[PDB]
């Protein structure tokens, strides 16, 4: 019954499109949903297979923005739940036509040290070969 409340996340994530108008607005509000950061990754992930190649690339930006909206490494715990399927989600973007753009967010996580290299090995498996 109460589990229907989680649909407040999945219906809005499915409504997202390739624009900062939809990304920055929902990623800012998603930080107030930190009370369920464990399931938010499950909603956003299953929309990648639903979406087109350029569209699922845009949905992948949401995860990167939500990690960085929690910000300042004060806890940044959103990164830990995204790490559960971070490479598995990248398996939906093996096409070099999109892998080149998903490397944009993975490049930032690598330079911003948002993840240990041991995790990035799975990111580069899923984006490269």
């Amino acid at each position: 019954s109460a589990g229907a409340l989680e649909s407040s996340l999945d219906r809005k994530f499915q409504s997202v499109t390739n624009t900062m108008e939809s990304i920055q607005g929902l990623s800012s509000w998603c930080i107030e949903n930190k009370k369920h950061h464990s399931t938010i990754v499950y909603h956003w992930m299953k929309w990648l297979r639903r979406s087109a190649y350029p569209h699922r690339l845009n949905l992948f930006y949401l995860a990167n923005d939500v990690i960085q909206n929690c910000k300042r490494k004060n806890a940044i715990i959103f990164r830990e739940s995204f790490a559960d399927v971070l490479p598995e989600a990248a398996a939906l973007v093996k096409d070099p036509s999109v892998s080149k753009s998903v490397e944009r967010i993975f490049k930032i996580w690598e330079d911003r040290n948002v993840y240990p290299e041991e995790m990035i090995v799975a990111l580069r498996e899923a984006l490269s070969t």
């Binding site: 944009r104 911003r112 948002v114």
Partner: peptide, 11 residues
């Protein structure tokens, strides 16, 4: 529908 730049948000 301006698409954003991943480095724009701070961390």
């Amino acid at each position: 529908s301006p698409s954003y730049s991943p480095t724009s948000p701070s961390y």
